[PDB]
Symmetry: C2
Subunit: 146 residues, 2 copies
């Protein structure tokens, strides 16, 4: 089931992990360019959605406010999670927000092209990344409205 | 996670529900054109996959062997599950095969355009159709190669 409270197209938000409390950031310099962060609110943590239509109905591009790059999540090559210019040129720019099975208020950030979800954890490196496999709570996110 | 044993493109199979043991038929006359069935094997139970690429990577159109029509699954009008000619002209012709979280030998037939899964049950009417909501065992299917 698609998450029922997806931000209206163009509305700004942070993506905050339910369990760690960390937010995603997307910037253009200093690797890692997309990662999790546990600190003050900065503009590189702000995103909006481009709504997919046609073959991308129920998919969304995740665009960085300060730099205009959209997120990607791929299993092909490093960096596995990153950003790129455009409005969703590549199939791995398109995400589905899939509501959790037990927690109605959180969702997984799923990528159809790569069959992966994003996760945020405090344990093994890489502590932020994507993953193809079983459902874990560290895969659960909130939309934080600004 | 995508089912790891999706039949090669052009390989013929039936779609059998795990628990009911019923198969999907797709015929060209007499509503319902697509429904569940038990009894001897007939040609209109036979399907192949059209493999999606680019935006449709990891999706598939389910094409009837004898009549060439592809399945569709929608929520906008009756019939909800049906067939249409072509090779996946419309977005609701495209399905994802999502492995069960518990049973790695079965999968759900998921429709991205409508956010539905196909189900086969002996209990309440309608006994076959599509569904948006919790994961139940009556939503699990097998590829039965012929
Ligand atoms: C100051 C600094 O270099 N911080 C980086 C650090 O974060 C570690 C903290 N203990 C934390 O709370 O996470 O490592 C991470 C990668 O895990 C980042 O690179 C941090 O760089 C700060 O990131 C924010 C993101 O909102 C901004 O880009 C800041 O400009 C950047 O310094
Ligand atoms: C596009 C390409 O040739 N490959 C990668 C390259 O980017 C080169 C462009 N000319 C450019 O962006 O300047 O390096 C970047 C670094 O982040 C990417 O990995 C490119 O990979 C392409 O990335 C997209 C991201 O959405 C997809 O993974 C594509 O499949 C991949 O080819
Ligand atoms: C379980 C394990 O060996 N750890 C990590 C591993 O292996 C996973 C499979 N080989 C796979 O499908 O990739 O490598 C990946 C790197 O992508 C993960 O870090 C695995 O850790 C698992 O990650 C999930 C993320 O949601 C959870 O943190 C699990 O607790 C963790 O075991």
């Amino acid at each position: 089931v698609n998450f029922p409270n997806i931000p209206a197209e163009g509305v700004q938000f942070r993506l905050r992990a339910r369990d760690t409390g960390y937010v995603i950031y997307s910037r253009t310099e200093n690797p890692p360019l997309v990662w999790q962060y546990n600190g003050p609110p900065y503009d590189d943590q702000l995103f909006t959605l481009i709504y997919g239509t046609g073959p991308r109905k129920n998919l969304y591009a995740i665009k960085s406010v300060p730099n205009g790059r959209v997120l990607f999540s791929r299993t092909s090559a490093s960096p596995y999670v990153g950003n790129i210019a455009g409005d969703g040129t590549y199939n791995d720019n398109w995400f589905q927000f899939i509501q959790d099975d037990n927690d109605p208020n959180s969702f997984r950030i799923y990528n159809l092209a790569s069959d992966t979800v994003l996760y945020s954890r405090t344990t093994a490196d890489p502590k932020f990344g994507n993953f193809t496999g079983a459902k874990y709570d560290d895969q659960l996110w909130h939309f934080e409205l600004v």
